[PDB]
Amino acid sequence: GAMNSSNYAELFNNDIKLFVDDTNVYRVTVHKTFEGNVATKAINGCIFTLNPKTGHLFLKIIHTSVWAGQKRLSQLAKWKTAEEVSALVRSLPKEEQPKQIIVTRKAMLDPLEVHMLDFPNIAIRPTELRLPFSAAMSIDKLSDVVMKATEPQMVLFNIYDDWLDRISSYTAFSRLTLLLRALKTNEESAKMILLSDPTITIKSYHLWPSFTDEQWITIESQMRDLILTEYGRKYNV
Amino acid sequence: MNTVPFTSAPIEVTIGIDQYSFNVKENQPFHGIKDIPIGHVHVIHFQHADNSSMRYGYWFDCRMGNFYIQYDPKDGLYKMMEERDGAKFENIVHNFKERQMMVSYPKIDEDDTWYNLTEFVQMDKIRKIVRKDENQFSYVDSSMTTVQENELSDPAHSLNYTVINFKSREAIRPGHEMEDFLDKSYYLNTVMLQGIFKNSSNYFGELQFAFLNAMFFGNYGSSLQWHAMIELICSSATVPKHMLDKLDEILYYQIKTLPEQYSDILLNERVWNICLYSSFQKNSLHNTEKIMENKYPELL
Numbered sequence: 019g020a021m022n023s024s025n026y027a028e029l030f031n032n033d034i035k036l037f038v039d040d041t042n043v044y045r046v047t048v049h050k051t052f053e054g055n056v057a058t059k060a061i062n063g064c065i066f067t068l069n070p071k072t073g074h075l076f077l078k079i080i081h082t083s084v085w086a087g088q089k090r091l092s093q094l095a096k097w098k099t100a101e102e103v104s105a106l107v108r109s110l111p112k113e114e115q116p117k118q119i120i121v122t123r124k125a126m127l128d129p130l131e132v133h134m135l136d137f138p139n140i141a142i143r144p145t146e147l148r149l150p151f152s153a154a155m156s157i158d159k160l161s162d163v164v165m166k167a168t169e170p171q172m173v174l175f176n177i178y179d180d181w182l183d184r185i186s187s188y189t190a191f192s193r194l195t196l197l198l199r200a201l202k203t204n205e206e207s208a209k210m211i212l213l214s215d216p217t218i219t220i221k222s223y224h225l226w227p228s229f230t231d232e233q234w235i236t237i238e239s240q241m242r243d244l245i246l247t248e249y250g251r252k253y254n255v
Numbered sequence: 256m257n258t259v260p261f262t263s264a265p266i267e268v269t270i271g272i273d274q275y276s277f278n279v280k281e282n283q284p285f286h287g288i289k290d291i292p293i294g295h296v297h298v299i300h301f302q303h304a305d306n307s308s309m310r311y312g313y314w315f316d317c318r319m320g321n322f323y324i325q326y327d328p329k330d331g332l333y334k335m336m337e338e339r340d341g342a343k344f345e346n347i348v349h350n351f352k353e354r355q356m357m358v359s360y361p362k363i364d365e366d367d368t369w370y371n372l373t374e375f376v377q378m379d380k381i382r383k384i385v386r387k388d389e390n391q392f393s394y395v396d397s398s399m400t401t402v403q404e405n406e407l408s409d410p411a412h413s414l415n416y417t418v419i420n421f422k423s424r425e426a427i428r429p430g431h432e433m434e435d436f437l438d439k440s441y442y443l444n445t446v447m448l449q450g451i452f453k454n455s456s457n458y459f460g461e462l463q464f465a466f467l468n469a470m471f472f473g474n475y476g477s478s479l480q481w482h483a484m485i486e487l488i489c490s491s492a493t494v495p496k497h498m499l500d501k502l503d504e505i506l507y508y509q510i511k512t513l514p515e516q517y518s519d520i521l522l523n524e525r526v527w528n529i530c531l532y533s534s535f536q537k538n539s540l541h542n543t544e545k546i547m548e549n550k551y552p553e554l555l
């Protein structure tokens with residue numbers, strides 16, 4: 019069934035599962051034509067496929083050439099996502115294939131279900147959670163590899179850096195969703211928080227800065243403040 | 256013209272014959288139905304006055320034998336039976352017709368409704384959907400479930416309709432996932448018409464039979480099957496032109512004949528709104544769309 023507040027700890031049990039977010043697959047800039055009409059120009063996108071227990075991220079880069087001469091792209095984007103996720107599963111060894119795939123948007127249910135007909139035992143699930151994975155392109159290293167790609171490409175990351183050496187998956191996922199929720203509501207402020215102290219660096223093999231445990235508590239506090247305010251600065255409270 | 260005689264009528268019951276029906280009182284001297292038009296299948300059906308639960312009935316074709324009804328007080332229903340002895344049966348029917356103990360199949364000569372609802376329905380195909388080879392006629396009731404319903408429990412009493420499932424490997428060509436799910440022509444024309452049904456006549460016959468079992472018995476699995484078979488055609492961008500014109504006529508007479516007060520359960524909103532207004536064939540069902548709009552615009 020659907021994933022929500024009440025069955026949240028299932029994410030961190032020992033059944034392999036992936037989140038699939040398609041919000042950054044088909045990306046456009048909308049502009050004006052010489053005649054004064056409006057046209058879109060596509061830029062590179064990505065499928066955000068995440069193991070919430072391990073932090074393994076399968077970032078399938080979607081090159082703009084995919085869209086050449088295609089119609090109804092926003093519809094095609096959902097089917098292209100499902101084709102690539104199915105290809106990813108088929109590429110994994112059987113003991114690594116997920117038992118569940120949770121789509122962050124319900125319009126991915128039928129496209130993924132049809133592409134996974136070969137996998138009757140893999141459950142395709144929606145979610146009632148409003149997860150902030152659209153903000154993944156606010157992580158500089160992920161944005162950089164997507165924009166520089168010249169062809170279709172899969173890039174593997176651990177979105178938790180080394181956090182699982184010190185914290186649980188539940189705690190790591192909560193930190194991740196707090197960081198992304200902050201980048202989503204006010205990117206500039208979120209990014210200022212993460213970089214204010216020049217002495218804390220991002221390791222070459224990491225996505226996020228190398229905070230001590232005490233510094234993460236301060237950072238996480240600052241991100242909460244931001245999210246509440248922007249919710250005040252929005253609804254005035 | 257043929258005749259289906261009744262030994263007796265021991266319990267109060269509403270008897271239908273095709274789209275007609277009449278009330279028979281307990282132990283009323285009712286001995287059958289005469290002037291039944293030859294050349295069509297027919298359905299005789301029953302709703303007891305005391306247990307509106309269980310509508311049930313018999314599909315038959317008077318060319319295939321001499322059939323009659325007798326109340327079984329053990330099993331508690333009107334049963335159809337076949338009479339081997341041809342002059343014993345002609346004796347029975349004549350003696351009855353002389354005592355004028357039979358109702359007349361009340362067809363208006365202008366009226367082609369039954370023909371139009373049963374145009375492609377053949378007994379041979381019915382007998383394959385309702386499996387019971389020791390009888391020339393076929394029993395159906397409100398509660399029987401379909402093969403596909405059983406999959407998702409007594410197979411002897413199943414309706415073995417052709418299984419249609421839009422998110423199935425039979426329906427979706429590997430590599431054409433999006434193409435086949437959004438345009439079902441492959442599944443319609445190659446898988447179902449060419450492969451399973453062989454021709455559109457046998458497809459239309461199963462469609463018509465499912466509708467009639469939904470209407471006369473309130474059979475839910477049959478209603479599901481009727482809607483599925485409509486949706487497969489309307490969701491195909493490529494349908495033979497003769498099929499589309501004929502589908503319009505078929506659906507027209509089904510909606511025309513449906514009880515105005517049963518449209519809440521026997522009609523599926525999603526299927527009809529997609530078929531008349533969103534699908535490839537939104538413009539190829541003028542007669543059906545016209546009568547649906549003037550008679551069920553709430554649904555839409």
Ligand SMILES: OCc1ccc(OC(F)F)cc1
Pocket residue numbers: 259260261262263287323324338344347
């Ligand atoms: O005893 C077998 C038999 C009984 C009655 C018949 O007519 C019935 F329709 F009224 C025909 C055959």
